[PDB]
Amino acid sequence: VPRVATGAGIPTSRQTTVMVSKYSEKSPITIPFEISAACLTHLKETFE
Amino acid sequence: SFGPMKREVMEFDPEDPYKVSKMRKLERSIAKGYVYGADHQAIT
């Protein structure tokens, strides 16, 4: 802390220790995605 | 003679029941980098 005090009778506020823990915040996203079984059939049945 | 040699490849390969389905689990996760949720005895 930037410390300063002074004066003749002006009260001197003592030194200050500041520790702040500041958290993070999660936001898990998701897009859905579609592949049909008719799409996967042609790789995996091997027609003529 | 060629007929039953196409047959006895088919009728002698499978040891797992829906063997195509485990081949579907391989041929997706190789294209898509170890998809989760492949192995489920449950239905969600």
3-state per-residue secondary structure call for chain A: CCCCCCCCCCCCCCCCCCCCCCCCCCCCCCCCCCCCHHHHHHHCCCCC
- Helix, strand, coil % over all residues of chain B, rounded to 5: 50, 0, 50
What Å distances lie between residue B4 and A15, B13, B15, B16, CA to CA?
A: 94, 14, 20, 22
Q: Burial level of B11, CB count in 10 A (0-12/13-18/19+)? A: exposed
Nearest to A19 by CA among A35, A46, A1, A42: A1
Contact B7, B13 (CB under 8 A): no
How many residue contacts between A and B have a Cβ separation below 8 Å? 7
Q: Residues with Cβ < 8 Å from A5, sequence gap 6 or more?
A: A11, A12, A13
For testing contact with chain B, the best of A43, A45, A46, A48 (most B CBs within 10 A): A43
**Chain A neighbors of B20, CB-CB under 8 A:** 44
**Chain B neighbors of A43, CB-CB under 8 A:** 27
**Quick one: tokens of B32?**
């898509």
Single-letter amino acid, residue A16 = T
Method by which the model was determined: cryo-EM
Nearest to A44 by CA among B10, B33, B30, B27: B27
